Amino acid sequence: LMYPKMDILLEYASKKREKPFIMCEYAHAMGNSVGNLKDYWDVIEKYPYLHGGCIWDWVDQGIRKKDENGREFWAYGGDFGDTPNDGNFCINGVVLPDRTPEPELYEVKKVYQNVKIRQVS
Amino acid sequence: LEYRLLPKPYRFSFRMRISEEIPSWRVLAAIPETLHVEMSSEDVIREGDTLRVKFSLLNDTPLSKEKQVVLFVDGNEYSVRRVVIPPFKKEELVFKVEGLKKGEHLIHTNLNTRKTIYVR
Ligand SMILES: [Mg+2]
């Protein structure tokens, strides 16, 4: 499934299932985003038949262009007199076009890490 | 009735000093004053069922705490418990929520603990 809410995951884990549950796209990273990423994985690690998924997506499809003054900016839909266009809906990354990390990539690293540490005392 | 110590938990503290002069009663030694808290439940349940919300409260500090744990559902005050945690002690609570209809529901406290709960 694509961008399922939590209730869906928990519903799928609530009865015996022959097939494992995978999220081919989840946590849409458009602009300043990727909220409640730990809340997904708390569930995936707890309940049966949930085996992860893939974040949408890696890189922002922003073309390099120069303005009137000659200062560089990232271009998106409607910045080439192209009509009809769907604006900045092609800017969905965790990294900028040049692969410069957006803060949200630091959260992905934390939540994906493979060591878990608990405080006994 | 309103002048009788009925048998419930009770805490009580005071400062003592042995010195040649009388120190200012308004001044005291600083100490940490916060509790550690964890909330936990079934992230989901079936319409009609009962939601069980568990709360662990650790007191690492050198004084007795006396706290009023309030449970909110969808912003409205649903229930409250009175606790007395002695120093170097954890206390566990269970609340029972009843009557949640289909759809997502906000469970939060007055101790900075929050959680979305789905109702199939
Ligand atoms: Mg972004």
Please give the C-alpha separations between residue B65 and each of A47, B6, B37, B57, in angstroms, as whole numbers.
Answer: 36, 19, 13, 10
Closest CA to A31 of A63, A65, A56, A3: A56
Cα–Cα–Cα angle for A43, B68, B10, nearest 5°? 125
Give the closest-approach CA distance of A24 to chain B in angstroms: 22
Grouping H, G, I as helix, E, B as strand and the rest as coil, residue A45 is helix
The closest CB to that of B118, out of A7, A42, A46, belongs to A7
| Catalytic residue flag (residue A72) | no
**How many Å apart are CA A24 and CA A57, to the nearest integer?**
11
**What contacts B86, CB < 8 A, 6 or more positions away?**
B11, B59, B64
Q: How was this structure determined?
A: X-ray
Q: What is the resolution of this structure in A?
A: 3.7
**How many Å apart are CA A94 and CA B81, to the nearest integer?**
43
Determine whether the interchain pair B118/A14 forms a contact, defined as Cβ–Cβ distance below 8 Å.
no
Omega before residue A84 within 30° of 0, cis: yes
Q: For residue A63, report the phi and psi dihedrals to the nearest 5 degrees.
A: -70, 145
Structural domain range at position B113? 32-120
